[PDB]
Chain A
Amino acid sequence: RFVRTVLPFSQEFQRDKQPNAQPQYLHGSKALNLAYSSIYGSYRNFVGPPHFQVICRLLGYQGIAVVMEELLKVVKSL
């Protein structure tokens, strides 16, 4: 399992603003939205096999190859 560190050395991510819309577009009604958020809150504090398998399913094979090549280039630069 992967867990977050302490005293971060980088804070330059500056992610994009979250999209906001009616409750219907995301997990149906408002009551349903809270339940799902609580359910998935246990996966936020760590990264493990469940995250990797979902990535494999979503990325197929092209995503894996491009990610591997980019990681190799990153290692080469470092």
Chain B
Amino acid sequence: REIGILTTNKNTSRTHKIIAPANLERPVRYIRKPIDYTILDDIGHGVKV
């Protein structure tokens, strides 16, 4: 009890060397599409033509 008056807990914890997510990042297939100029109209004061 006497040494305990001057004692505090330690913020020590254990974690694995490497931790991975539950779901990995799967690759996404590439699809060719043409240039579209009507994608920024819905944001801001756009103009529809």
Taking Cβ atoms with an 8 Å cutoff, the residues of A that contact B are 61-62, 64-66, 68-69
Which B residues lie within 8 Å of A66 (CB)?
A: 2
Closest B residue by C-beta to A62: B2
Smallest CB gap from A60: residue in B: B3
A61 to B3, CA, bound (A): 6
CB contacts (< 8 Å) of B3 on chain A: these are 61-62, 64-65
The residues of B that contact A62 with a CB separation of less than 8 Å are 2-3
Which residues of the partner chain A approach B2 to less than 8 Å between Cβ atoms?
A: 61-62, 65-66
Report the minimum CB–CB distance from B5 to chain A (whole Å).
Answer: 7
Bound CA span A66–B6, Å: 11
CA–CA, A69 to B2, complex, Å?
A: 10
Within the complex, the shortest CB–CB distance from A32 to chain B, in Å, comes to 38
Cα-based distance from A62 to B5 in the complex (angstroms): 12
- Which B residues touch A64, using CB under 8 A? 3
Q: Mark B1-24, 1 if CB is under 8 A from A, else 0.
A: 011011000000000000000000
Q: How far is the CA of A66 from the CA of B3 in the complex (A)?
A: 9
Highest count of chain A CB atoms <10 Å: which of B2, B5, B6: B2
